[PDB]
RNA sequence: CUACACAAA
């Protein structure tokens, strides 16, 4: 229902920056302007968050659905 | 009707003391072994009549009761003619000759394994029970090579398993219905089991002469480690120094020396459709085993494949018995898997991608096919299509178009020019007989061609 | 000598020069500096040590060193009547169990008494995990930025017995410590795998079936260590892993020393041509110990007839088989000295850990 | 896939806590596919972006088997709540609950 | 199952130390046999893995809708531009032994679905006693009737 | 128990 506390694959704690990432991503998408928002590159944002260049961690960070955005 | 008295109640039956669960794979189980979850082993019971010769062995089961495994669930009293649950049997604490103890299923018990629909004689086979003491496992685990008996796979298949509790049924399950008796098909008179998928390509990789790294050799430690999980008596490596290099054929012969056989056949790896391309190593394209020594050649579907008549397991069964063949299938499967534990095998999206030159060549082949089809159409426009007697012009035109749009056998040239046979996982799966066919590769990489429905 | 050579410790840090990151952290956490606990990436170079030992150290640091997690005691989750129906016990317990904590005291107990009196959905954060027992925390054991959950309007979430539980990662992944970052061999040459003729290969110029690398670079990330005491935490982790391996090896040393007494976990045979077979079965033993034992027995006995182990995923045990042209006493002496070499190797590793991190 | 895409676990209902449903599975964590399709503009995606290694690993994934990470299971990968219901009527004044 | 229709039953669960890992520490959640592909022709899953490898590095979510233009050569070149190999393959090490595979292994994010077929629901075991039919005297039918 | 529906191999 939220971004997981740790990455499902390797256990890196992406949940430390889950909330900061969500709100910073909403902000960064807003200045960059449903599908065109998803194609905005978040490499720099996630790197500035401190998360490493790990396929699993960025995958689970950017793809996890937020229940609050749907309910 | 199918659900009437005769067909439902008389010709079939609902039975007690039977279990059903999803089946998954377990590489460490023998072909005649089935993995039984411990929860099911404490549900199904074996009726052991207490006598003087077995009272000491049955005592731990009685003392454990339903609290610890292995235990028991009921005791039939001879002088009472009444069964008593063990939980309520605190005041008995005495096993008499003629008492029947219902104990839990333990490792080594025989069990009937069945998959529906039961079409073959091997659809019900007897496996040795291996109880999986992990409580998190609730599947019926079996070796992937045992799947050929039941036409099973691990995509959701469920299988019935019941443990014989009667002495007569247990005797006959062990002596008559054991899966060693179904190693040779009653239908085709040939072998049923063998290496499948990972083990076929693993046998090929292990026994191939050359790898991209050079000669297919391993040091003494890795040659030893190939035999770690073989679960038989390991060979001797005392004459090998750590610096020594052993071929894959050497370790395969060290395994095959226990049951020496003579085998001489070309492998599935060597095909004439790939011969114009590739560079077939001379030592790879002629498999020869002399008294258990793999002299040369790769081991693949023709030699170790499941249902391969004249293969090495068929010869082992003919000379030493089907149980020895099952043990050798397990041992060779372990060798292949332990080899791929270091070699590694994969398939990638780049494994099925043509080079731009090969793409242009495939385009040219397809364009020539469409050109022949357009020539037939031009002939139809001019009225030059003259059907033979008994054929209409429409049917003759359809036959001409069907033949014109057939892919030539040279469609493999662009495919194989883009493929490295030494490193292509998809090609190696196809060519070794592990999985896939030449039409599969052509459809994936070159083109589907003409869709035919009812010819 | 110095087996554990140069170490590079680099914490993962939030880059506040990014305007969006800084704005979000400020607005919803009032956070302008780095968090109290940061992930630390430790890259270690090892020279003159078998790959079995380096990988055993890595495996232990991943999921065999004892670790601490937050768990809820049975009955800690208060059902009540105004509790959120979407924040189930299982979901919240999964969130809490995987919060990385750097806890020096097991006595600490936390509670989560959250209530949403607003008209909107309120998010519960780790900053709402209030300590209710144990000594007052001079430093936080977890970051306050995790989203434990969200409360529907008018709903609550009360959890009363969030305590600290110890365990190892192979039993439950919430005790996993170190995530893998890098592993390579520095004494094996590598191909330029950017070319089409090498992209299907690993890159190493030697087949793993023949190579014996002794110079390795191992990179492991630790998920939450305090910002000021980074080197101390890393040193403690490394020394604890070395001690864990040494203790597990001594558990088998005792078995060898008790060989005259027929213990069930070691059996010996007298097969044939002066050869004796030693089979050592140890329940709940992993590939770390089996591979270490096999590698060092092989190094001691290069002419061994056979040495090998198997950790079947079921049967939950390690079975190590040694066949050697020697007497039972001779084989036991050789195995004992190989175990002593393993212990010496990991003692040197601990010592070098101390000299390096400092 | 059309068949399997409809038995996939996920957020089977958004109002699940107010429903007494039987044989219904609510999977906690859902992800948008890294490579999404237009179907996810109109329906919620059910599943996760698992890292998948296409490889032979001990022969435990043959014939449609899959080797899973125990840690991925422990962290909540495809974890959820299964729900059953027990509805029992009172018939008439003869029967009562106690 | 994947979105390409490749069903699978979870056969083995391995701890984090037993699972294979790439040189940069990436390890899978699932290990899928390559033999599931060649006969089933589920190239869409393979292409989706190749695309998602670069999507994860770029931090994007792209459209893989059917019949949209696709160029697998350009997707592989995109992988190369992202800093990976032309194929998505990487140097992998065996988690149990620590020894690298001689072959680079194709590993990447493939969207997977958990089909609602639970072994705990499907498994059944009955003992020698239970409810029987009144007419035939045979056991009742199946798990629902608590005997069969 | 008799339909019927949804599913699995
Ligand atoms: Mg099937
Ligand atoms: Zn990760």
């Amino acid at each position: 229902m939220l971004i997981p506390v740790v990455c499902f694959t390797c256990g890196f704690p992406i949940g430390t920056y889950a909330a900061i990432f969500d709100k910073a991503r909403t902000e960064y998408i807003k200045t960059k302007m449903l599908d065109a928002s998803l194609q905005i590159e978040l490499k720099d944002l996630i790197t500035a968050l401190g998360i490493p260049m790990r396929v699993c961690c960025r995958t689970h960070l950017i793809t996890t659905l937020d229940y609050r955005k749907y309910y | 009707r199918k659900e009437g008295r005769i067909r439902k109640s008389l010709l079939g039956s609902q039975v007690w003391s039977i279990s059903r669960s999803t089946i998954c794979g377990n590489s460490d189980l023998h072909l005649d072994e089935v993995g039984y979850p411990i929860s099911f082993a404490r549900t199904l019971q074996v009726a052991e009549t207490v006598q003087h010769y077995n009272i000491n062995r049955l005592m731990p089961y009685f003392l454990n009761g339903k609290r610890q495994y292995p235990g028991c669930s009921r005791v039939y009293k001879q002088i009472t003619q009444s069964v008593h649950d063990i939980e309520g049997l605190k005041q008995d604490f005495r096993l008499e000759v003629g008492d029947i103890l219902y104990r839990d299923v333990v490792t080594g018990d025989v069990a009937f394994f069945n998959r529906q629909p039961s079409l073959e004689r091997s659809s019900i086979g007897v496996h040795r029970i291996v109880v999986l003491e992990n409580p998190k496992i609730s599947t019926f685990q079996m070796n992937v090579s045992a799947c050929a008996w039941y036409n099973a796979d691990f995509d959701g298949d469920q299988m019935n398993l019941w443990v014989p509790w009667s002495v007569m049924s247990r005797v006959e399950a062990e002596l008559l219905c054991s899966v060693r008796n179904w190693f040779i098909s009653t239908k085709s008179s040939g072998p049923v089991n063998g290496q499948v998928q990972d083990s076929t390509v693993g046998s090929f990789l292990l026994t191939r002469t050359n790898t991209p790294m050079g000669k297919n050799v391993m040091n003494k430690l890795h040659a030893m480690g190939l035999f770690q999980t073989t679960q038989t008596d390991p060979p001797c490596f005392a004459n090998y120094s750590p610096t020594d290099l052993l071929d894959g054929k050497s370790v395969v012969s060290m395994l095959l020396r226990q049951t020496p056989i003579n085998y001489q056949r070309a492998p599935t790896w060597y095909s004439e459709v790939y011969a114009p391309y590739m560079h077939y190593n001379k030592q790879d394209i002629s498999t020869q085993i002399r008294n258990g020594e793999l002299i040369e050649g790769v081991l693949d579907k023709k030699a170790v494949g499941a249902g391969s008549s004249g293969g090495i397991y068929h010869l082992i069964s003919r000379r030493y018995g089907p149980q020895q063949a099952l043990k050798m299938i397990f041992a060779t499967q372990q060798l292949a898997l332990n080899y791929v534990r270091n070699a590694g095998f994969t398939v990638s999206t780049a494994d099925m991608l043509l080079t731009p030159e090969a793409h242009q060549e495939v385009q040219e082949i397809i364009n020539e096919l469409l050109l022949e089809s357009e020539e037939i159409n031009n002939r139809l426009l001019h009225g030059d299509i003259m059907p033979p007697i008994g054929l209409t012009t429409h049917d003759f035109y359809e036959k001409l178009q069907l033949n014109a749009l057939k892919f030539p056998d040279r469609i493999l040239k662009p495919i194989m020019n883009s493929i490295n046979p030494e490193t292509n996982g998809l090609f190696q799966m196809v060519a070794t007989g592990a999985k896939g066919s030449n039409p599969n590769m052509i459809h994936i990489m070159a083109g589907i061609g003409q869709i035919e429905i009812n010819t | 000598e110095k087996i554990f050579q140069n170490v590079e410790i680099k914490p993962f840090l939030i880059d506040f020069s990014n305007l969006f990151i800084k704005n979000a952290a400020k607005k919803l956490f009032q956070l302008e500096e780095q968090l109290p606990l940061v992930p630390v990436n430790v890259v270690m170079d090892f020279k003159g040590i078998s790959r079995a030992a380096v990988h055993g150290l890595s495996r232990v640091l991943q999921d065999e060193i004892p670790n601490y997690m937050l768990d809820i005691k049975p009955g800690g989750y208060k059902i009540e009547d105004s509790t959120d129906l979407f924040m189930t016990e299982q979901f919240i317990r999964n969130r809490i169990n995987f919060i990385p904590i750097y806890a020096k005291n097991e006595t600490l107990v936390f509670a989560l008494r959250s209530l949403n009196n607003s008209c909107e959905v309120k998010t519960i954060y780790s900053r709402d995990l209030i300590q209710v027992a144990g000594p007052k925390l001079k430093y936080p054991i977890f970051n306050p930025t995790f989203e434990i959950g969200f409360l529907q309007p008018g709903k609550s979430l009360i959890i009363e017995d969030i305590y600290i539980k110890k365990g190892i990662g192979r039993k439950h992944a919430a005790f996993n410590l170190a995530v893998k970052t890098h592993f390579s061999h520095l004494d094996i040459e590598q191909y330029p795998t950017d070319k089409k003729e090498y992209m299907a290969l690993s890159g190493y110029k030697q087949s793993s079936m023949t190579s014996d690398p002794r110079h390795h670079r191992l990179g492991l990330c630790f998920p939450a260590v305090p910002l000021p005491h980074i080197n101390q935490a890393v040193r403690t982790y490394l020394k604890n892993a070395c001690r864990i391996i040494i203790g597990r090896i001594q558990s088998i040393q005792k078995i060898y020393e008790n060989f005259e007494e027929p213990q069930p976990e070691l059996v010996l045979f007298s097969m044939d041509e002066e050869k004796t077979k030693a089979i050592i079965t140890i329940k709940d033993e992993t590939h770390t110990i089996g591979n270490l034992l096999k590698t060092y027995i092989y190094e001691m006995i290069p002419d061994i007839s056979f040495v090998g182990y198997q950790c079947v995923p079921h049967k939950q045990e390690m079975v190590l088989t040694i066949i050697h042209k020697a007497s039972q006493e001779d084989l036991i002496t050789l195995l004992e000295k190989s175990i002593q070499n393993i212990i010496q190797t990991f003692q040197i590793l601990e010592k070098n850990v101390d000299e390096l991190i400092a | 896939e059309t068949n399997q895409g409809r038995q996939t676990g996920g957020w089977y209902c958004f109002s699940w806590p107010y429903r007494v449903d039987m044989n219904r599975f609510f999977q906690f964590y859902n992800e948008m596919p890294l490579v999404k399709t237009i179907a996810h503009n109109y329906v919620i995606p059910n599943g996760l972006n698992t890292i998948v290694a296409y490889m032979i690993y001990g022969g435990y994934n043959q014939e449609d088997s899959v080797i899973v990470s125990q840690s991925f299971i422990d962290r909540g990968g495809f974890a959820g709540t299964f729900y059953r219901e027990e509805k029992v009527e009172l018939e008439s004044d003869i029967e009562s609950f106690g | 199952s994947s979105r390409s229709g490749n069903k699978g039953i979870a056969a083995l669960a391995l701890p984090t130390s037993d699972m294979p890992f790439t040189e940069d520490g990436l390890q899978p959640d699932l290990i899928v046999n390559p033999h599931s592909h060649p006969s089933r022709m589920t190239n869409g899953q393979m292409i989706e893995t190749t695309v998602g490898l670069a999507n994860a590095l770029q931090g994007v979510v792209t459209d893989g809708t059917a019949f949209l233009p696709i160029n697998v050569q350009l997707l592989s070149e995109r992988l190369a531009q992202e800093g990976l190999r032309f194929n998505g393959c990487q140097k992998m090490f065996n988690g149990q032994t620590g020894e690298y595979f001689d072959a680079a292994i194709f590993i990447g994010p493939t969207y997977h679905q958990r089909l609602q077929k639970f072994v705990l629901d499907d498994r059944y075991a009955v003992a020698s006693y239970g409810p029987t039919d009144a007419l035939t005297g045979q056991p009742l039918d199946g798990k629902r009737s608590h005997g069969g």
Side-chain angles (χ1 to χ4, degrees), chain B residues 336-389:
Chain B
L337 295 174
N338 292 336
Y339 180 83
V340 187
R341 225 172 283 282
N342 269 95
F345 191 72
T346 202
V347 64
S348 166
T349 325
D351 276 354
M352 53 199 66
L353 186 64
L354 292 179
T355 61
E357 312 98 73
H359 191 106
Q360 266 323 102
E361 199 159 6
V362 167
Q363 256 295 131
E364 278 146 30
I365 291 174
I366 284 171
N367 285 341
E368 107 175 296
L369 294 184
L370 289 175
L371 209 76
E372 176 62 272
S373 167
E374 259 146 2
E375 298 279 12
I376 302 181
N377 286 334
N378 282 323
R379 274 170 53 206
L380 181 89
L381 294 204
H382 294 346
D384 289 355
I385 300 292
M386 314 301 337
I389 177 156

Side-chain angles (χ1 to χ4, degrees), chain B residues 115 151-157, chain D residues 64:
Chain B
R115 195 192 93 98
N151 189 43
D153 41 12
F154 309 130
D155 70 318
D157 293 41
Chain D
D64 301 298

Side-chain angles (χ1 to χ4, degrees), chain E residues 42-126:
Chain E
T42 44
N43 325 107
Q45 161 179 4
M46 291 297 329
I47 298 162
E48 174 219 12
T49 300
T50 279
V51 176
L53 260 172
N55 282 7
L57 291 195
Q58 285 163 357
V60 296
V61 170
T62 48
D63 218 55
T65 323
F67 310 110
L68 280 182
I70 167 161
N71 205 335
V72 182
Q73 169 81 34
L74 270 310
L75 304 166
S76 296
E77 290 168 21
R78 174 177 182 242
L79 275 195
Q81 290 168 25
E82 269 325 292
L84 315 151
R85 298 185 198 197
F86 182 83
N87 46 17
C89 300
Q90 299 178 52
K91 186 209 313 292
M92 209 144 306
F93 300 81
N94 189 7
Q96 303 166 343
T97 56
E99 320 180 346
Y100 56 94
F101 302 100
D102 275 337
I105 301 298
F106 189 60
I107 177 167
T110 309
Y111 199 82
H112 265 255
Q113 330 163 300
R114 190 223 183 124
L115 311 190
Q116 291 175 55
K117 296 275 319 167
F118 310 97
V119 61
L120 287 160
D121 291 6
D122 303 359
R123 67 152 183 196
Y124 183 53
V126 73

Side-chain angles (χ1 to χ4, degrees), chain D residues 1 4 7 9 31 34-36 46-48 50-55 57 61 64 66-70 78, chain E residues 1 3 7-9 11-12 14 18 29 31-33 40 45 55 62 64 94 106 108 110-112 114 116:
Chain D
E1 153 68 8
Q4 300 159 191
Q7 330 170 339
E31 288 190 37
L34 261 183
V35 193
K36 64 163 285 172
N46 322 279
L48 292 166
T50 60
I51 304 290
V52 175
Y54 300 87
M55 69 183 308
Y57 202 70
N61 40 351
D64 301 298
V66 177
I67 304 166
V68 201
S69 187
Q70 180 60 246
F78 298 126
Chain E
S1 147
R3 279 179 305 159
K7 268 173 302 312
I9 287 277
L12 180 66
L14 288 172
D18 292 357
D29 305 350
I31 303 185
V32 157
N33 207 223
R40 300 197 229 283
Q45 161 179 4
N55 282 7
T62 48
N94 189 7
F106 189 60
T110 309
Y111 199 82
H112 265 255
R114 190 223 183 124
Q116 291 175 55

Side-chain angles (χ1 to χ4, degrees), chain B residues 26 28-29 130 132-134 136 141 212-213 217-222 224-229 231 233-238 240-242 245 338-339 342-343 350 423, chain C residues 51 171 191 197 199-201 204-211 275 277 291 294-295 298 301-316 321 323 325:
Chain B
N26 198 334
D28 289 305
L29 287 175
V130 169
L132 318 158
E133 298 212 23
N134 191 345
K136 290 199 287 208
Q141 315 207 316
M213 281 306 69
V217 281
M218 68 224 48
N219 66 103
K220 176 206 178 145
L221 186 62
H222 285 79
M224 268 179 327
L226 254 48
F227 289 88
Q228 276 170 340
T229 88
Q231 263 158 73
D233 298 315
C236 185
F237 297 84
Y240 293 108
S241 156
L245 301 174
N338 292 336
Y339 180 83
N342 269 95
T423 53
Chain C
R51 146 187 65 192
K171 307 312 238 207
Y191 285 124
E197 61 254 6
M199 56 169 213
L201 313 177
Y204 286 124
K205 290 206 186 109
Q206 296 169 46
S207 158
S208 45
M209 305 234 75
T210 68
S211 74
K275 265 182 317 163
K277 201 206 268 150
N291 208 29
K294 184 191 64 148
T295 285
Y298 184 62
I301 323 175
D303 79 25
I304 190 145
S305 174
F306 177 83
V307 60
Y309 81 101
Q310 44 173 337
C311 286
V312 183
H314 66 100
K315 310 195 75 32
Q316 286 122 314
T321 311
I323 310 197
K325 281 148 180 215

